Amino acid sequence: MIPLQHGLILAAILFVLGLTGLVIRRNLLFMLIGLEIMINASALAFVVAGSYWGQTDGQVMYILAISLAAAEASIGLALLLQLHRRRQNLNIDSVSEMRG
């Protein structure tokens, strides 16, 4: 008696909020934060879908989603550390040299 539509709507709201944070912020740290928000929203959507059908598949896909999320957070934060080490700023618009 909790609708699947409401859970999917909540996950979609969090996904588009994470996408908005990923786009509008020039800071690479806030871009990684937005990426974490989007992948957590997708994992929440999988949990909602699995709970609607009464299957463990949603939680299995949640586990795979957070394994991916942890690994990409590690890789992105290492890249952010290298960028801050060799540029002393996190402005992602500064790294735009290759073009055309």
Partner 1 sequence: LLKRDPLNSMMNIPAVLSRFAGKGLLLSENGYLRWYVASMSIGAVVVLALLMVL
Partner 2 sequence: MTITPQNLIALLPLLIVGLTVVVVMLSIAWRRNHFLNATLSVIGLNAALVSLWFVGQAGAMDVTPLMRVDGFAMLYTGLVLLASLATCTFAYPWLEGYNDNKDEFYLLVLIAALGGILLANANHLASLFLGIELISLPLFGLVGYAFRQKRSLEASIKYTILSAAASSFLLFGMALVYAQSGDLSFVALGKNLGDGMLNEPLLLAGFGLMIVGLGFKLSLVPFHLWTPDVYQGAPAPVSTFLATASKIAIFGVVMRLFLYAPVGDSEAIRVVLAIIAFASIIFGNLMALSQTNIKRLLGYSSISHLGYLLVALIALQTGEMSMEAVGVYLAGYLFSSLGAFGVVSLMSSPYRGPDADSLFSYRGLFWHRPILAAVMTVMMLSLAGIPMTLGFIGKFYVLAVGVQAHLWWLVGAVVVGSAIGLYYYLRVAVSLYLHAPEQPSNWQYSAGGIVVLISALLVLVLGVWPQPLISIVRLAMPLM
Instruction: Decide: residue 78, CB within 10 A, 0-12 exposed, 13-18 middle, 19+ buried.
Output: exposed
Q: Between residue 17 and residue 76, which ones bind partner 2 under the rule CB under 8 A? A: 18-19, 22, 28, 31-32, 35, 38-39, 41-43, 45-46, 48-50, 52-53, 55, 57-58, 60-61, 64-65, 68, 71-72, 75-76
Tokens of 87: 């540029």
By the 8 A CB rule, do 47 and 62 touch? Answer: yes
Residues in contact with partner 2 by the rule CB under 8 A: 4, 8, 11-12, 15, 18-19, 22, 28, 31-32, 35, 38-39, 41-43, 45-46, 48-50, 52-53, 55, 57-58, 60-61, 64-65, 68, 71-72, 75-76, 79, 82-83, 86, 92, 95, 97-100
